[PDB]
Every structure is written in C-alpha cells, then in structure tokens.
Design a protein that fits this description.
The chain has one domain (about 1-365). The radius of gyration is 21 Å and the shape is globular. It has helices at about 15-25, 55-60, 65-70, 105-115, 185-190, 190-200, 240-250, 255-265, 295, 305-320, 330-360; strands spanning about 5-10, 30-35, 50, 80, 85-90, 105, 120-125, 130-135, 140, 145-150, 150-155, 175-185, 200-205, 210-220, 220-230, 270-275, 290. It is an alpha/beta fold. Helix content is about 30%, strand content about 25%. The structure holds flavin-adenine dinucleotide. The PDB classes it as flavoprotein. The entry lists the keywords Nucleotide Binding, Oxidoreductase Activity, FAD Binding, Response to Antibiotic, Oxidation Reduction Process, antibiotic, flavoprotein. It forms a monomeric assembly.
C-alpha cells in the first residue's frame, strides 16, 4: 500500500543494491536498478565476500537465497604466517562453524541476485551523472543515455558516490592506509611456493607494518592484497614501478612472497577511506531518497566489516517500506536511518580501531 504505483529506482547493482531490489520486488514493488557496468558479463574485481549469520545470511534468507548462497559458497580455513614463511597457527573450520562464514565469489553473488530478479529489472550501461528533484518526481541523468524518473531514489552505488548531496554534505576521507591488490590465475603454476603455503586456506601475514592477505581459491584464481600505512614514485599502469616498490618493502620477506610479487601481472592500488557517520543526515529533502551500503557508511575492511552492514540496510529499509508500520515513506526512511546510524557507528568505530591495531608496530595477530 505504502509504495502503491510508486516507481522505485536503485542506483548501483552491487551486492547491497541488488539485495535491496529483490527484497522490494518480492513485495510487488516496481523497482529498477541502474548500473554503470556495460553488461552483466562484466567481471567484478576483488576478493571473496563472507556473509554473517545475523545480517548478510538473514538478508539472503528473507530473499529466499540462503540455500543458494550455501550451495555456491565455500568454507575456508585461515593460516597465519610470518615473513620467513612459517605457519604460526592454522585456524580450521569445525563442522559447527562450517556454514558460519563461507566465502563466495563476487560474480557468483551478483548472478544469484540477478537470477532472483525479474528479467530486465537491472538496466546495464547506465552511469548516473546527476539527480535533480521535480515537484513530484526525481529526474535521473545518465551519461550519453536517456533520462529516467522515479518516486523514490535509493543511493547504493558505493563508497565513492557523487550523488549524495541531497542526503548529506558529508565527504569521504582517507584513514591513512593503502591497499595494492591483484589476481594470479593458475597460482599452482605461477606462484607454487606461496600457493602451497596457503595450502587451501586463506593466509595472513604481518611484518613491519606491512600486511598481506590472500585467498588461494577465488574461482580458480588466487587473489591477494598488500596493505601498509600511507606516507608518488608508483604508476599502477607500469607493473615495474609497483614490483620495485613492493620488493623494497618486502626485502625482509621469504622468497616465496617475492615470487608472488614478481609473477603478478596487473596491480590495483586503492587508498583506504571512510564515509563517516558522525553528523546526522539532512532533515528536509525535496523528495523521498536515502542511501544504503558503502554509499551510506564506507569503512576500512581489515576487520571484516563491510557488505554485511549494507545487507542489514537493505533488510531494514525494505521491511520498513513494506511492513505497513509507517504512515509515510519518509517516516519509514527516518526509522531505517536511525537504526543504521546506531549499529553503523559501532561498525565504523570497530573498523577504525582495528585498522590502527593491525598496522601498529607491535601487531602479531
Ligand atoms: C580491499 C578491500 C577488501 C574488502 N574485503 C571485504 C571483505 O572481506 N568482506 C566484506 O564484507 N567487505 C569487504 N570489503 C568491503 C565490501 O566490498 C563493500 O562493503 C561492499 O562491496 C559494499 O557493497 P555496495 O553494493 O554497497 O557497493 P559496491 O560493492 O561498491 O557496489 C556499487 C555498485 O554501483 C555501481 N556504480 C558506481 N557508480 C555508479 C553510477 N554512477 N551509476 C550507476 N551505478 C554505479 C558500481 O559499478 C557497483 O556495481 C572490502 C573492501 C576493500 C576495498
């Protein structure tokens, strides 16, 4: 009733936006997702995602995708290593924990979510450039593409979104660490020493404020990231400048790690950032709008916070808009944001404290 004959548009086909779309759509809501990626075959770069029982998994369950997530996700142990290649501890998964936090590939997750949507719910190759209100509908502008309208806009296009002003003036800011990530295909061939060191588990190592994280089996490829406190001699279009840089930082490290760096083809660098939720969001907005996911609360990832907060957002917001407990769309948005500010501020504070802890000089997992 609340959303009757209301055209809802979600900006961004990430995991949060798509989950939001499904939870709305299954309540008979007209929902469109606009995604800048040119087609659904676009590969998603990055490591795997793990859904927690009380948040991400609950969102999948309410969407009817929990068993699908289990069917595709993969339980994985963790090895803690030192710079000399020693395994300090192996934290393996007991049966009682095997489905607690199984890791799933980002493209796989996109696909199950896309498959849960009606055909053409998601419009590909639609990069939102500007969002402007009308007396009754939003006007959405796409780069070199026809414009669209909506009665309610949900910003879900990530932590670097540029279309937040009508909700908040808050700016993203850098937290002081930097990440270099890459994929190695056929790691059993290209980086065998380090591959066997992972030994089918995720691997983490810390030495001199330099942290390394790896997943040996991300749909047949090894994904890894190296992270450090920030402060440019490095061009990421020039793999040579990156290798020279990483090999200096990892001079103390075992050759198996040096092999990993030398064989990597393409490096991706990214400054860690946070969209701080300190100051409250705008009280009066021209038309119904809100934000979910990283657009709402981007935060450091080193403690495992991230997508699950965003899936919690989709769950509460979609509930509020469709559980009939609110007199207006605005009141339903108001309640969601109040809840999200509460448990989201907690997540951010945990993520900031962990970032300081892990890149401190004494850190030893
Ligand atoms: C190095 C690193 C490691 C991480 N590790 C983890 C981890 O282990 N676990 C975890 O839970 N989280 C992790 N995170 C965080 C996690 O990836 C995010 O919290 C999660 O992806 C949030 O999803 P989202 O849908 O809100 O945003 P995104 O995943 O960024 O999705 C945004 C979507 O919007 C699209 N988009 C962007 N601009 C536009 C536009 N103008 N118009 C239309 N569409 C647009 C994008 O193409 C994308 O499809 C990590 C992050 C980093 C940087």
């Amino acid at each position: 009733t609340l959303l009757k004959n209301k055209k809802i548009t979600i900006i961004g086909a990430g995991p949060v936006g798509l989950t939001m779309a499904r939870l709305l759509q299954q309540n008979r809501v007209d929902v469109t997702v606009y995604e800048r990626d040119k087609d659904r075959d676009a590969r998603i770069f990055g490591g795997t995602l793990d859904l927690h029982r009380d948040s991400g998994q609950e969102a999948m369950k309410r969407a009817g995708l929990l068993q699908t997530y289990y069917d595709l996700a993969l339980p994985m142990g963790v090895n803690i290593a030192d710079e000399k290649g020693n395994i300090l501890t192996t934290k393996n998964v007991k049966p009682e924990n095997r489905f607690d936090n199984p890791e799933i590939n980002r493209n796989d997750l996109r696909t199950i979510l896309l498959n849960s949507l009606q055909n053409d719910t998601v419009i590909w190759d639609r990069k939102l450039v500007t969002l402007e209100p009308d007396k009754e509908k939003w006007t959405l502008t796409f780069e070199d593409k026809p414009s669209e309208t909506a009665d309610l806009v949900i910003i879900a296009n990530g932590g670097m979104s540029k279309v937040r002003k009508f909700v908040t003036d808050t700016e993203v800011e850098e937290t002081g660490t930097f990440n270099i990530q890459a994929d190695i295909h056929q790691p059993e061939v290209n980086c065998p020493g380090f591959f066997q060191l992972c030994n089918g588990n995720r691997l983490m190592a810390a030495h001199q404020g330099n942290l390394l994280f790896a997943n040996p089996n991300n749909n047949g490829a090894l994904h890894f990231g190296i992270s450090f406190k920030t402060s440019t001699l490095v061009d990421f279009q020039d793999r040579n400048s990156v290798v020279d840089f990483l090999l200096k930082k990892f001079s103390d490290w075992d050759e198996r790690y040096k092999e990993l760096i030398r064989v990597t083809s393409s490096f991706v660098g990214l400054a860690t950032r946070i969209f701080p939720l300190g100051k409250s969001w705008k009280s009066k907005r021209p038309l119904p709008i809100t934000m979910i996911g990283d657009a709402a609360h981007l935060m450091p990832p080193f403690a495992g916070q991230g997508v699950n907060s965003g899936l919690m957002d989709a769950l509460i917001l979609s509930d509020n808009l469709t559980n009939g407990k609110f007199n207006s769309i605005e009141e339903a948005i108001e309640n969601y944001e109040q809840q999200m500010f509460a448990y989201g501020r907690e997540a951010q504070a945990e993520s900031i404290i962990n970032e300081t802890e892990m890149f401190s000089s004494d850190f030893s997992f």
